[PDB]
Amino acid sequence: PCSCDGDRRVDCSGKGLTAVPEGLSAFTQALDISMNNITQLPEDAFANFPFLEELQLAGNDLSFIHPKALSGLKELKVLTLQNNQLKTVPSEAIRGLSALQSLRLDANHITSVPEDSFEGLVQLRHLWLDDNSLTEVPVHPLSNLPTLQALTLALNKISSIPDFAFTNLSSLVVLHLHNNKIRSLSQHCFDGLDNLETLDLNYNNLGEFPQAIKALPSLKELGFHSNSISVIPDGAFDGNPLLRTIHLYDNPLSFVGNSAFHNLSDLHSLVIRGASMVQQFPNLTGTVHLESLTLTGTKISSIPNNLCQEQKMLRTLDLSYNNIRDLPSFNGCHALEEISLQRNQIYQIKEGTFQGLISLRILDLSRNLIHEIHSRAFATLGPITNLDVSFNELTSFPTEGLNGLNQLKLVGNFKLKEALAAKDFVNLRSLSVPYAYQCCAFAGIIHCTPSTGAFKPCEYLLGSWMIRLTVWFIFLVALFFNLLVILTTFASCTSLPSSKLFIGLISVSNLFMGIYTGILTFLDAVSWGRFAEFGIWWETGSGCKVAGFLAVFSSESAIFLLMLATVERSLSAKDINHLKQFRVAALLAFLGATVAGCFPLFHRGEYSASPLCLPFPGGETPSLGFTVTLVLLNSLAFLLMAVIYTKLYCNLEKEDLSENSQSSMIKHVAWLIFTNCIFFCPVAFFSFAPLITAISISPEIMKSVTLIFFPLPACLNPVLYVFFNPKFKEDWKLLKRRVTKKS
Amino acid sequence: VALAESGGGSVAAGGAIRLSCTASGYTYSKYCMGWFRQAPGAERAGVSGITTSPYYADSVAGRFTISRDNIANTLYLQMNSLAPADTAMYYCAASRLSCSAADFKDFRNFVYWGQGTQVTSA
Amino acid sequence: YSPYCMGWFRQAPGKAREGVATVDLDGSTIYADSVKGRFTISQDNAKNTLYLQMNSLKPEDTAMYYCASRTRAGVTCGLNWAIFSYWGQGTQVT
């Protein structure tokens, strides 16, 4: 059933045995039984084999052991019984084996240890007791063992350690007690453990720093974390000089002694986080083997200048969330690699601060108040790969010896507007720059976060030559025909009717829109091929604000004056005394256009979204601050006069419309309003586009029709008027008569 | 004390592989073990580890299983659907103190190291 | 010969061995949760014979039994196995 190794070794795995195997050679040396179904051990089960050395009973459910069953095994060395179903430590059947070496009792639900247990074992060296349900340390059975080396009691339910627990263990080397529920430690609990090297107390509920550790003279590695320790008194580590590793994290530490960490001749790393009230740098005299130093969350304001004159082998350095104001020189250091200084009050950089660090790779100085950086700062600094400096008021950024850089982030430095030289950064992989136009110099595989897409072009503002000539065309004739029509309507020395003065104001508003378009065309013509250079200055200056205000103002006056024109016509027909009434209404509407245009100016960043200074296209996120409001006002008005004119259609018949000159005026107004409706639908649709997730159009296209479909009325309204109202011809003859009389 | 590993070799992409490590001794803490990956020209990195919620690396998430059997004191790591970037040398590391997940991205804490194996994926 | 920690144990097929009320040398028997009002234990040291009695027993909990003895000293009574040096062969009651 079980194979024979030939060297006196017998192995049994999952062969369904409920009793001890028999018939094997009496000279076998090692016996393993695992995964079978033995539940009880009969008396004199192992009397057959007198030369057994190592004994494995793994995984089966043994529950009862006869006291005399284990007798006769005087040479047994290793005994393993884990994951079985014993409930108490077998004080009997164990006293016989004098020459036992290692004993493993894991995963067995054990609650009580008999007093006379572990008696007669004179040379036991390893004893494993974890994952059980122990509730108090077996002081007497432990004292019974004088030659124990390694002790593990983990995951048990111990609550407190009484005094003089481990007096008689002279040669104990390592002690593991983690995940227990210890909360109090006596001052003399650990006496006698002179040769203890490793001490583990993790995840316990310690509420105050223990003192008994000062009795240990040769404690190498010490680990406690996730506890509730909050205060580190000075002189704590005085007793034990040699400490390679100190584990502490997740503790809610508040105060740490000035001289606590002093005179540790062999400590390797030091980490302190969350210690808020500590405000003065620790005294590190005598510690000359510190690879890594980390202090976070404190109130430190200054740094000693002998720091790495002492620390000759420091490799990394991080100091963030402090109140550091000035930086002492780091010239002495040679092995320093990574430096992090964030959320501090640094405001200037000097040449000498970073001089002499040969092997510095990663440098971070983010979220500070630095505004002055010397040109020669970074000049003789060695090969540096990743440099991050952002969210600081910075005016000019030098570049000397940065050719080896790979990662460079500068975002939030709105004061920085100078372009970036492409030749210097030869091996740059990832950029972050505050304004998208700067990346146009690289024209990128370089990665620049800012989108620098169509809405923010590099070479031409208007893009296509056809679009350029088209806007040039409507600009011109809008201007010329608007001037002609206003001269015809106003220069005549005749009484001015309400409708005539109304169309005059229409002409004035359309003229304003036209020279807004003209100023845009002038900018495009001037900045041909090099828009990237001028973009930042143009958007930041007041010109963009002026242009946007002009456009917005021109577009509201036209709409409101048209609405007032068609109710003027409606009630004029109806009374067929409101002339002065409507004149000041027109004035009041002009004032409203003025204030509506100037309202966004007091806000921040509303007019700088696009180089065109028109907010209605918006962008990635215009987040409808007032765009939705404006389109709502425009649509509601249009539907109002749509209803008004439908009512007029119902009231007055078509034959009277054909035979009435006032109705010819009505037809002209109807043409005007219909044109205004269809030419304003597209911009409203574009503003509604981001609200719907399904619809998406390329910035190429939305820019083109936003450019084309905005100013058309300023062009066709005067053309419509002169082409289809002989009223203009009559005024033309009148002004010809006046000119002939003058000349 | 002594650590030994078995497994490894050359496998076409998308295969499955099992790596088994055995340990002998008593000083090590059975609640801190890890598998470490090394590619030439770079320092060791921690692929996976057992802590007391196993710690898994960013990259190998969803394709790597780590298990421990204290019945026979063996550590198992099974991989499936490998990518060629997984071709490297593998180590088993055991500590002397209990450890958390935060201790696994720094190898210097671990002390007991194995001889290692080599696995290549095509 | 030496009266010290007499005990009685019950064993059902396929599970562990648990104890029932046991008496020490000085009397004052430690009494299990299910035996008060059910079983009576007496012990005479003239011959060193212990007697047990059954009262109103239920159909279940009928299994093999054992009696256990110990001659050593230095451990408190706890009505728990692994402390008695000598064990009887036992008897089935049902």
In whole angstroms, give the CA distance from residue A308 to residue A316: 11
In whole angstroms, give the CA distance from residue A186 to residue A184: 7
A223 contact residues in B (CB cutoff 8 A): 97-98
| C-alpha A44, offset from chain centre | 70
- SS3 for C27-74 is CCCECCCCCCCCEEEEEECCCCEEEEEECCCCCCCCCEEEEEECCCCC
In whole angstroms, give the CA distance from residue B39 to residue A451: 36
Contact A572, A663 (CB under 8 A): no
Q: Measure Cα distances from A201 to A240, A246, A271, B86, B103 in Å.
A: 17, 12, 18, 37, 16
Residue A409 backbone dihedrals phi, psi, to 5 degrees: -120, 130
Q: Does residue B19 sit in helix, strand or coil?
A: strand
In whole angstroms, give the CA distance from residue A105 to residue A82: 5
Q: Which two tokens stand for residue A569?
A: 């016509």
Q: Which two tokens stand for residue A430?
A: 């990832």
Question: Would strands B74-80 and B55-56 be described as parallel, antiparallel, or unpaired?
Answer: unpaired
CB-based contacts of A119: which residues, under 8 Å, 6+ apart? A91, A95, A141, A144
In the numeric block, the tokens 């012990």 are attached to: C43
Query: Is A107 within 8 Å of B96 when comparing Cβ atoms?
Result: no
Distance linking the first and last C-alpha atoms of chain B: 35
Instruction: Inform me whether the C-beta atom of residue A13 falls under 8 Å from chain C C-beta atoms.
Output: no
Question: In this structure, is the dihedral angle defined by the CA atoms of residues C9, C10, C13 and C17, taken in order, positive or negative?
Answer: negative
Overall resolution, Å: 3.9
Of A455, A470, A466, A472, the C-alpha closest to A525 is A472
| C-alpha A527, offset from chain centre | 38
Q: Which two tokens stand for residue A557?
A: 């006056």
Query: Is A202 within 8 Å of B26 when comparing Cβ atoms?
Result: no
Q: Which two tokens stand for residue A600?
A: 């966004």
Question: In this structure, is the dihedral angle defined by the CA atoms of residues A631, A632, A637 and A640, taken in order, positive or negative?
Answer: positive
Q: Which two tokens stand for residue A36?
A: 């079978």
Beta strands in A591-717 (DSSP E): none
Q: Which two tokens stand for residue A657?
A: 């419309």
H or E, element range at A247: strand A245-247
Which technique was the structure solved with, according to the deposited record? Answer: cryo-EM
Q: Measure Cα distances from A370 to A305, A374, A385, A654, A709 in Å.
A: 21, 11, 21, 77, 47
b/e map of A559-579 (b: 16 or more CB within 10 Å)?
Answer: bbbbbbbbebbbebbeeeeee
Q: Measure Cα distances from A604 to A66, A540, A599 in Å.
A: 88, 12, 11
In whole angstroms, give the CA distance from residue C69 to residue A553: 109
Query: Which residue among C74, C78, C87 places its CB closest to the CB of A116?
Result: C74
Best to test chain A binding among B27, B68, B97, B103 (most A CBs inside 10 Å): B97
Report the C-alpha dihedral over residues A305, A306, A307, A309, rounded to 10 degrees: 130
Contact C23, C43 (CB under 8 A): yes
Of A549, A645, A648, A567, the C-alpha closest to A606 is A549
3-state helix, strand, coil in chain A (%, to 5): 35, 15, 55
What are residue A151's DSSP bridge partners?
Answer: A127, A175
Contact A498, A544 (CB under 8 A): no
Q: Measure Cα distances from A79 to A58, A66, A90, A588, B25 in Å.
A: 10, 16, 13, 102, 14
Q: Which two tokens stand for residue B92?
A: 């088993």
Query: Is C87 within 8 Å of A115 when comparing Cβ atoms?
Result: no
Best to test chain B binding among A202, A249, A270 (most B CBs inside 10 Å): A202
Rounded (10°) angle between helices A661-688 and A699-709: 160
Residue A693 backbone dihedrals phi, psi, to 5 degrees: -75, -30
A82 contact residues in B (CB cutoff 8 A): 70-71
Query: Is A154 within 8 Å of B102 when comparing Cβ atoms?
Result: no
Contact A226, A205 (CB under 8 A): no
Q: Which two tokens stand for residue C86?
A: 């000598």
Give the other-Cβ count within 10 Å of A245's Cβ: 17
Hey, what amino acid is at A741? K
Q: Does residue A26 sit in helix, strand or coil?
A: coil
- DSSP-assigned letter for residue A711: S
In whole angstroms, give the CA distance from residue A17 to residue C63: 24
CB-based contacts of C77: which residues, under 8 Å, 6+ apart? C5, C22, C24, C30
In whole angstroms, give the CA distance from residue A213 to residue A199: 10
Query: Is A200 within 8 Å of B31 when comparing Cβ atoms?
Result: no
Query: Is B71 within 8 Å of A198 when comparing Cβ atoms?
Result: no
Question: Would strands A245-247 and A221-223 be described as parallel, antiparallel, or unpaired?
Answer: parallel
Of A680, A619, A611, the C-alpha closest to A462 is A611
CA distance A93 to chain C (A): 9
Query: Which residue among B71, B96, B109 places its CB closest to the CB of A34?
Result: B71
Give the other-Cβ count within 10 Å of A537's Cβ: 10
Of A442, A505, A516, the C-alpha closest to A479 is A516
In whole angstroms, give the CA distance from residue B115 to residue B120: 17
CB-based contacts of A392: which residues, under 8 Å, 6+ apart? A365, A366, A367, A368, A369, A370, A371, A412, A413
Give the other-Cβ count within 10 Å of B44's Cβ: 18
In whole angstroms, give the CA distance from residue A295 to residue B14: 45
Q: Does residue A382 sit in helix, strand or coil?
A: coil
In whole angstroms, give the CA distance from residue A124 to residue B61: 44
Angle (CA) B85 B88 B92, round 5°: 130
CB-based contacts of A239: which residues, under 8 Å, 6+ apart? A213, A214, A215, A216, A217
Q: Which two tokens stand for residue A81?
A: 């019984």
In whole angstroms, give the CA distance from residue A419 to residue A480: 41
B70 contact residues in A (CB cutoff 8 A): 82-83, 106-107
Distance linking the first and last C-alpha atoms of chain C: 31
| C-alpha A131, offset from chain centre | 41
CB-based contacts of B42: which residues, under 8 Å, 6+ apart? none
Residue A402 backbone dihedrals phi, psi, to 5 degrees: -100, 10
Hey, what amino acid is at A497? P
Report the C-alpha dihedral over residues A502, A508, A513, A517, rounded to 10 degrees: 150
In whole angstroms, give the CA distance from residue A526 to residue A466: 18
Angle (CA) A215 A217 A221, round 5°: 105
Q: Measure Cα distances from A310 to A232, A291, A304, A339, B121 in Å.
A: 24, 12, 11, 18, 48
Query: Is A112 within 8 Å of C80 when comparing Cβ atoms?
Result: yes
Give the other-Cβ count within 10 Å of A228's Cβ: 13
Contact C82, A89 (CB under 8 A): yes
Residue A470 backbone dihedrals phi, psi, to 5 degrees: -60, -45
Of A58, A68, A10, the C-alpha closest to A38 is A58
What are residue B45's DSSP bridge partners?
Answer: B37
Contact A236, A216 (CB under 8 A): no
Instruction: Inform me whether the C-beta atom of residue A141 falls under 8 Å from chain C C-beta atoms.
Output: no
In whole angstroms, give the CA distance from residue A155 to residue A235: 31
Q: Does residue A398 sit in helix, strand or coil?
A: coil
In the numeric block, the tokens 């009148």 are attached to: A734
Residue A163 backbone dihedrals phi, psi, to 5 degrees: -70, 150
Query: Is B98 within 8 Å of A174 when comparing Cβ atoms?
Result: no
Residue count of chain B: 122
Best to test chain C binding among A94, A110, A116, A144 (most C CBs inside 10 Å): A116
Query: Which residue among A65, A85, A114 places its CB closest to the CB of C83?
Result: A114
C78 contact residues in A (CB cutoff 8 A): 112, 114
CA distance A318 to chain C (A): 59
What are residue C6's DSSP bridge partners?
Answer: C23
In whole angstroms, give the CA distance from residue A31 to residue A53: 8
| Burial of residue A698 (number of CB atoms within 10 Å: 0-12, 13-18, 19+) | exposed
Instruction: Inform me whether the C-beta atom of residue C75 falls under 8 Å from chain A C-beta atoms.
Output: yes
Instruction: Inform me whether the C-beta atom of residue A225 falls under 8 Å from chain B C-beta atoms.
Output: yes
In whole angstroms, give the CA distance from residue A261 to residue C13: 63
Hey, what amino acid is at B25? G
Query: Is A58 within 8 Å of B71 when comparing Cβ atoms?
Result: yes
In whole angstroms, give the CA distance from residue B42 to residue B45: 9
H or E, element range at A57: strand A54-58
In whole angstroms, give the CA distance from residue A448 to residue A436: 8
- Find the DSSP H helices in A689-742: 699-709, 712-723, 726-742
Listing from the earlier edge strand, what are the strands of the sheet with A407-409? Answer: A269-273, A292-296, A316-320, A338-342, A362-366, A386-388, A407-409, A430-432, A447-448
